[PDB]
Design an enzyme around this catalytic site. Structure first.
Site, short mmCIF file in Angstrom:
data_model
loop_
_atom_site.label_atom_id
_atom_site.label_comp_id
_atom_site.label_asym_id
_atom_site.label_seq_id
_atom_site.Cartn_x
_atom_site.Cartn_y
_atom_site.Cartn_z
N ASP A 57 0.77 -1.26 0.06
CA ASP A 57 0.04 -0.11 -0.09
C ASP A 57 0.96 1.27 0.06
O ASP A 57 0.59 2.06 1.24
CB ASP A 57 -0.90 0.04 1.18
CG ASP A 57 -1.89 0.95 0.97
OD1 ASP A 57 -3.37 0.92 1.68
OD2 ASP A 57 -1.98 1.95 0.12
N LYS B 172 2.05 0.92 -5.27
CA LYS B 172 2.78 -0.16 -6.42
C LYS B 172 2.33 -0.31 -7.62
O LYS B 172 2.78 -0.09 -8.77
CB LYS B 172 3.04 -1.56 -5.59
CG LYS B 172 3.87 -1.27 -4.31
CD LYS B 172 5.07 -0.80 -4.58
CE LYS B 172 6.06 -0.28 -3.17
NZ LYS B 172 7.33 0.27 -3.39
N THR B 173 1.06 -1.14 -7.95
CA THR B 173 0.39 -1.49 -9.02
C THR B 173 0.12 -0.32 -9.71
O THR B 173 0.02 -0.10 -11.04
CB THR B 173 -0.90 -2.35 -8.76
OG1 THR B 173 -1.78 -1.48 -8.03
CG2 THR B 173 -0.52 -3.56 -7.85
N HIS C 214 5.32 -8.04 0.22
CA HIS C 214 4.75 -8.86 1.68
C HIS C 214 6.00 -9.66 1.58
O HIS C 214 6.68 -10.33 1.03
CB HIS C 214 3.27 -9.36 1.05
CG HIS C 214 2.56 -9.70 2.27
ND1 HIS C 214 1.25 -9.12 2.23
CD2 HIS C 214 2.97 -10.27 3.33
CE1 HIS C 214 0.66 -9.53 3.50
NE2 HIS C 214 1.53 -10.26 4.18
N1 LIG Z 1 -5.74 9.04 -2.43
C1 LIG Z 1 -4.71 8.54 -3.10
N2 LIG Z 1 -4.68 7.05 -2.71
C2 LIG Z 1 -3.51 6.41 -3.22
C3 LIG Z 1 -2.50 7.33 -3.86
N3 LIG Z 1 -1.61 6.20 -4.14
C4 LIG Z 1 -2.02 5.09 -3.92
N4 LIG Z 1 -3.00 5.20 -3.15
C5 LIG Z 1 -4.13 4.07 -2.74
O1 LIG Z 1 -3.24 2.83 -2.17
C6 LIG Z 1 -4.02 1.74 -2.65
C7 LIG Z 1 -3.44 0.31 -3.39
O2 LIG Z 1 -1.96 0.66 -3.66
P1 LIG Z 1 -0.96 -0.43 -4.28
O3 LIG Z 1 0.34 0.32 -3.98
O4 LIG Z 1 -1.52 -1.26 -5.61
O5 LIG Z 1 -1.13 -1.83 -3.09
P2 LIG Z 1 -0.79 -3.34 -3.43
O6 LIG Z 1 -0.52 -3.62 -4.94
O7 LIG Z 1 -1.80 -4.04 -2.87
O8 LIG Z 1 0.54 -3.46 -2.43
C8 LIG Z 1 -5.37 2.22 -3.86
O9 LIG Z 1 -6.22 1.83 -2.90
C9 LIG Z 1 -5.09 3.83 -3.84
O10 LIG Z 1 -6.24 4.33 -3.37
C10 LIG Z 1 -2.64 8.57 -3.95
O11 LIG Z 1 -1.67 9.37 -4.69
N5 LIG Z 1 -3.66 9.22 -3.65
#
Ligand SMILES: Nc1nc2c(ncn2[C@@H]2O[C@H](COP(=O)(O)OP(=O)(O)O)[C@@H](O)[C@H]2O)c(=O)[nH]1
Ligand SMILES: *C(=O)[C@@H](N)Cc1ccccc1
Lengths: 85, 82, 61, 205, 366
Positions: free
Chosen positions: E21, E24-25, E58
């Site tokens: 979180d 990343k993606t 993870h």
């Molecule tokens: N509001 C907002 N949310 C963010 C931002 N960058 C990432 N997120 C939140 O981060 C979450 C998942 O990010 P990710 O890095 O894909 O997680 P993972 O792939 O499961 O480890 C999403 O729900 C986005 O809302 C941002 O710049 N603004």
RNA sequence: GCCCGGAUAGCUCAGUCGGUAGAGCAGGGGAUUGAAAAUCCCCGUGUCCUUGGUUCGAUUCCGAGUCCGGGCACCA
RNA sequence: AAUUGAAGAGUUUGAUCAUGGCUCAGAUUGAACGCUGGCGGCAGGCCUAACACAUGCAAGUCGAACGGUAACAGGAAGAAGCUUGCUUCUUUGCUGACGAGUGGCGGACGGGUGAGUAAUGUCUGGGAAACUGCCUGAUGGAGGGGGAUAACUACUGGAAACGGUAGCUAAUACCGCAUAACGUCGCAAGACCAAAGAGGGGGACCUUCGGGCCUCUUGCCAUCGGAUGUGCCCAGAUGGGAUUAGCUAGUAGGUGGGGUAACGGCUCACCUAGGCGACGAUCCCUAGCUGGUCUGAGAGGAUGACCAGCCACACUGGAACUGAGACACGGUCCAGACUCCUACGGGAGGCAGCAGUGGGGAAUAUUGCACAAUGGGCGCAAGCCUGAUGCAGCCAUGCCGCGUGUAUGAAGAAGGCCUUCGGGUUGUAAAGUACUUUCAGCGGGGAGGAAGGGAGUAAAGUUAAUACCUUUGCUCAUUGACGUUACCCGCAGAAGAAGCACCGGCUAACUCCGUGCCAGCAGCCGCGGUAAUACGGAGGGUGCAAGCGUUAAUCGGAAUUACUGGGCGUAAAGCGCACGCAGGCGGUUUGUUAAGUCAGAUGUGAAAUCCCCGGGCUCAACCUGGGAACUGCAUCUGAUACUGGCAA
């Protein structure tokens, strides 16, 4: 199937319905003399035979009928009308 | 159809050619009516190496046989006159 | 059933193997030999003779 | 294809000399002939009837330096001949080129001439032949390549040949390093101490 | 597949490291979007070609993490503003160094959520000090702020900062050396049973070069057999010549799926042989740094991480040292349970149970 | 690559919800004998797969790796 | 010149001779496994799932057939830069050529598999109730018109596939008319039936200035032929089981109609009651057949991969159109299963063609190169297409050639091993020494597979013509995948190259240590119970060789299916006995027939393979010329002993 030789398929169908029009026309006349021969009218049968004569031989000449069918349809039919006569 | 063509028999890299009279709609090493002589382009500079029963060839010519380009040139090379 | 020819092996409960025919004349009812050196049938240790049989590789050094 | 090992051992087994290790020495005597081929040579072989067949077979084979595959094929190439197989078999065995140059004296010994042939040093009818199993045709002449002529080895070889057979079925000049081969070897003119009768009988089972 | 690849630009393989979180993606799609104007995605610049590596942040997926670290010349440390110096983010700096990443780009993410420069500079400082403790010049790493979600939606302001990311990607991260004159070596990471072509193995060319129609051989824990590089695809894009440093795919000479697995190594014919015995130099880490909390013993079996693998082997400690406490600086012999090419000077990691206890460096082959 | 079951002395399994490992089938060691069956005199050969932790204390508790069998993928 | 060809031993028993099984020694294979592994030549390489299939490719071609020219390259007109012909650039089918379309031809061949099939098939040999594009031979004709349509436009439905509405135009496409013959029908008279024009060049003449006209080439229409291919018919041959004994009702046949290229229950209507069957019908199971391959003294037995002939099939089942030919591998229509796309109404596909993947399995390979050669299709031709073929990769799978060196060499050593510790043996083996260099590796030379074709040009026929066309020479540049070729030469150094089974008897070749009816061995008799020539190891020795063994498999030994060539009192084997049909066999004399048989001849028995004699690859395998054989069938002409038929 993807081949430029599928052109024969479309040439077949246009030649298909065309041959049906010629053969059904050819076989229609054959049934005509049969009705005339069944009425006992040896003149009308002789007349109807003279009608399809230039027809069946016009069909064998072009390459459609294999000329032996044309011969036989006339042959026995020849002996048929004079069988009544 | 009929033709007086060749028929490549022989080993690999050391070819052999047999002038054969056959139906043109059949394979190279396929069926035929008869073989009329042969041809060896890789034989030697010996006494022989090429024989063609010219008469039987001409016998099928009047019958309607088509002589192929390879053997037609070979026929004139084996000197029909000489 | 098949004979497992060799001095020491490791086939236990599964270890898929290879079978070459041939009677053994000792055990009643068995006409097969397990090929040594196939699928899971390991080679017999301590072999300097007849290694074409028993699936033994030639000594290195 | 060759033995290429303790080659004089084969002459010890049969108890007879086969000219396998002649060389510059005329008579060897330092091989302990007729007493021990191996370690238990002091024992006595029983020589069963089948055993006398096999020992007679090998006897001729070690001399002509050929092996079973080629030997059995020479038998088959002898089997499809008229008259007698045995006499014709010794003809095909002597038909090999390496045998001829050995008979010529160009090659000192049997195996030595094979190396000489396989090293493109011998030519026949203007054609150098490397195949040792070259079936020599009657009425022809063999020679030695100019660039590979008299390199001290052929010199020692010819002087040794003066104390041997020098067959009548071939003519050697030994002055122009060129010899000619006549007709096929006759049974009455060859070794004769060896036997080929059993070799015919061994392969009939 | 079709379309032969043009070998005109240098191919520098980079990737992102961090924690769950952080964005990343989201950033993976963001890179390919602006430049157009374990899973991998690519993007090409008019100056060089860059390969991107997206690894899972993870702990349990360390298997995919280390395999993704094999293609890391420039680590893209994405750190969320609301998180900061995370343990695995710290471990990515750790294990990244365990495979040997020289340069690292620090990307401050989620800056749109916190408008406070004071703490954003502090979160920056926390990452700067995090790099310093793992022999990385954190004070020399270019810091770039940004927002992942907004840049992907099309916010030009955050999108233009991706140019700054690409700017430091071409300046702070240079094109590495490619030992092409040296014997070809290749870390086997993934296997693909391509339907219609057979078995395809992927990886990043370490040394030498490759080309279609080249005889190759696979060395590793499994007996070495022969194969042939019969097809070089790169994300469905054919290639005629793959040099060292290229992240391509190699088509085998018809092998079955279940033989060549993750762990072996493709190499140049008769060049590098496997080894069963070697000694290593280790830097045992502490419990807070990532290691154990109790001193291990002789005969203890941890896993060893080099270039791709997590191979298990028995630690052969020198006679006398039976208690190796967390924070030791010793050297011990290592008996692997499976033979594999061990080159003296090879830097690796000693892990077990989901944590890195030591920093291994192959000293000598015994 | 992920999700489970067996990995317990030669063999089959029990014992467990922390307390110094069992039984049956074996088989073996001796006297009698050319050698045994038969009779009698004595009987467990165990890293509970391995490595490690929460420890006065782990077979059983929680973790991993490897072996086998059973289910899912994934498609450069 | 052309089959000069045949082995046995172990084991029942206290011992023997018998009978009779069992087993091994040989050879072979579309081989697999284990170990080992240097090169080369020629072959073979999915036998199991006829299992499912990603992707590319596997049959297109003709402008010298037509309307057209969407593009590419020129000409010409024009037009803009600007060095006024250096360029930029808009039209134009007027040319070279040419996507899409009309048409002709090919697509039924080539290629693959063996599931199906026990006779509708195949093989051998005869036969008549047939057809046959392309090719060729003979005699003729080729006169004159009309009506649509695709492409292209306007519009329009659909995601795509794939259409729909209304108009435009040509032809070797299509439909009449004219005209008909030794063609078809008919006893005859008579009746009836065909089509197409283009290309090159040119004198006179003629130009509604497209062209007509003369000539050459090519193609077309009709008929009888030939050759080839194909369809069909009868007889004989072509597996096992009798624990399959009755079976069939379009079934057996006749008359008439219909149907096919053709005969015919091929199919109908009526009628009759037959037809097949122990010298085997139906039924059941298995399986492509043959020339051949292997084995074997032959006879036979097994078998049918590769090459070739033939039949059958193409996801499954079925029907039919087109066309000379299919009732169809890369064609169509319908149903079904399995995959696939989907905008969920509806559509797309068939590797048993080259490769290739999964899956099965003990096991069988590259998503290669070129159309240079041969063959095939189109075309006048040049050329175009060609996963046929020609080659290459991979594999010891098989056969054949060759190398890992030769000579010398005694302290007759070291080390290993046995020992009567004397010594022997390893062992001329190695080392040392002296030469050579195949095949590998490196660098340069260098065949042939190439025949033709294109342009230029000469002569001779062609013609009104020095032109055009055609035939035969001459000349130029040449057309090569393999290919860093076959071969040759040079360079360096023994430098890079040997293991495998066995060692008691059968069956060539031994001792020692150790384990003690344990571990293990084995093809059979059997070894091992504390001195094992049979286990395991060590040495020595033997067989064979880049192969050596093992297992499966066929034949041989097996005269243990015996025609060749066995038996039946006691060993397995005479029905308890008899009558007797079909069947088998038959005294003696003559005549006669000439069926069997015999003699000779004819057609044929495909080719290849095999046997012989020669030739060409450094030899061989291999390729290959001629010959013989193909042990067979059918016909004709003779012979008349024996057998069989009729008569006395
Ligand atoms: N509001 C907002 N949310 C963010 C931002 N960058 C990432 N997120 C939140 O981060 C979450 C998942 O990010 P990710 O890095 O894909 O997680 P993972 O792939 O499961 O480890 C999403 O729900 C986005 O809302 C941002 O710049 N603004
Ligand atoms: C195939 O595209 C590889 N070159 C890159 C890759 C992508 C995804 C997963 C594994 C490898």
């Amino acid at each position: 199937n993807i081949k430029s030789a599928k052109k024969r398929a479309i040439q077949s169908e246009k030649a298909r319905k065309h041959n049906a029009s010629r053969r059904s026309m050819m076989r229609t006349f054959i049934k005509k003399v049969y009705a005339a021969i069944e009425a006992g009218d040896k003149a009308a049968a002789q007349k109807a035979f003279n009608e399809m004569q230039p027809i069946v031989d016009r069909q064998a000449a072009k390459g459609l009928i294999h000329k032996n069918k044309a011969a036989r349809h006339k042959a026995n039919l020849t002996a048929q009308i004079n069988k009544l006569a | 159809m009929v033709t007086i063509r060749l028929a490549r028999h022989g080993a690999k890299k050391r070819p052999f050619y047999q002038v054969v009279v056959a139906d043109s709609r059949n394979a190279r090493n396929g069926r035929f009516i008869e073989r009329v002589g042969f041809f060896n382009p890789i034989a030697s500079e010996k006494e022989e190496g090429t024989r063609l029963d010219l008469d039987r060839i001409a016998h099928w010519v009047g019958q309607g046989a088509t002589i192929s380009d390879r053997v037609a040139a070979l026929i004139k090379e084996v000197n029909k006159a000489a | 059933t098949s004979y497992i020819g060799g001095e020491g092996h490791n086939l236990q409960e599964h270890s898929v193997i290879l079978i070459r025919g041939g009677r053994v004349k000792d055990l009643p009812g068995v006409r097969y030999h397990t090929v040594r050196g196939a699928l899971d049938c390991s080679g017999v240790k301590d072999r300097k003779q007849a290694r074409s049989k028993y699936g033994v590789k030639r000594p290195k050094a | 294809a060759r033995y290429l090992g303790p080659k004089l051992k084969l002459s010890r087994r049969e108890g007879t000399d086969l000219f396998l290790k002649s060389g510059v020495r005329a008579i060897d005597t330092k091989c302990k002939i007729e007493q021990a081929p191996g370690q238990h040579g002091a024992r006595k072989p029983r020589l069963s009837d089948y055993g006398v067949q096999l020992r007679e077979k090998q006897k001729v084979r070690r001399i002509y330096g050929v092996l079973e595959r080629q030997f059995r094929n020479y038998y088959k190439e002898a089997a499809r001949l008229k008259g007698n197989t045995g006499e014709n078999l010794l003809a095909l065995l002597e038909g090999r080129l390496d045998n001829v140059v050995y008979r010529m004296g160009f090659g000192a010994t049997r195996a030595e001439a094979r190396q000489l042939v396989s090293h493109k040093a011998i030519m026949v009818n203007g054609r150098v032949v490397n195949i040792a199993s070259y079936q020599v045709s009657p009425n022809d002449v063999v020679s030695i390549r100019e660039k590979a002529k008299k390199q001290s080895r052929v010199k020692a070889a010819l002087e040794l040949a003066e104390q041997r057979e020098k067959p009548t079925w071939l003519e050697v000049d030994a002055g122009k390093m060129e010899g000619t081969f006549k007709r096929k070897p006759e049974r009455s003119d060859l070794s004769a101490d060896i036997n080929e009768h059993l070799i015919v009988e061994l392969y009939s089972k | 597949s079709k379309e032969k690849f043009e070998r005109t630009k240098p191919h520098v393989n980079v990737g992102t490291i961090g924690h769950v979180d952080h964005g990343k993606t989201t950033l993976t799609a963001a890179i390919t979007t602006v430049l157009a104007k374990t899973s991998h995605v690519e993007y090409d610049t008019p100056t060089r070609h860059y390969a991107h590596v997206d690894c899972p942040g993870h702990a349990d997926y360390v298997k995919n993490m280390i395999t993704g670290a094999a293609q890391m010349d420039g680590a893209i440390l994405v750190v969320a503003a609301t998180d900061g110096p995370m343990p695995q983010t710290r471990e990515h700096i750790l294990l990244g160094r365990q495979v040997g990443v020289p340069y690292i780009i620090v990307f401050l993410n989620k800056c749109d959520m916190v408008d406070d420069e004071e703490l954003l500079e502090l979160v920056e400082m926390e990452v700067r000090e995090l790099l310093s403790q793992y022999d990385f010049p954190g004070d020399d790493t270019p810091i770039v702020r940004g927002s992942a979600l907004k840049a992907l939606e099309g916010d030009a302001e955050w999108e233009a900062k991706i140019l700054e990311l690409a700017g430091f990607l071409d300046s702070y991260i240079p094109e590495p050396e490619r030992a092409i004159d040296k014997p070809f070596l290749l870390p086997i990471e993934d296997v693909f049973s391509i339907s219609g072509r057979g078995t395809v193995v992927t990886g990043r060319v370490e040394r030498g070069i490759i080309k279609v129609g080249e005889e190759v051989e696979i060395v590793g824990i499994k007996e070495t057999q022969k194969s042939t590089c019969t097809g070089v695809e790169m994300f469905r894009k054919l290639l005629d010549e793959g040099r060292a440093g290229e992240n391509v795919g190699v088509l085998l000479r018809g092998i079955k799926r279940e033989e060549i697995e993750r762990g072996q190594v493709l190499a140049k014919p008769g060049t590098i042989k496997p080894h069963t015995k070697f000694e290593s130099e280790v830097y045992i880490l502490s419990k807070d740094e990532g290691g154990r909390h109790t001193p291990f013993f002789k005969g203890y079996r941890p896993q060893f991480y080099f270039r791709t693998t997590d191979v298990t082997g028995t630690i052969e400690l020198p006679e006398g040292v039976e208690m190796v406490m967390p924070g030791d600086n010793i050297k011990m012999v290592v008996t692997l349970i499976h033979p594999i090419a061990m080159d003296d000077g090879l830097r690796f990691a000693i892990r077990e149970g989901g944590r890195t206890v030591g920093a291994g460096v192959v000293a000598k082959v015994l």
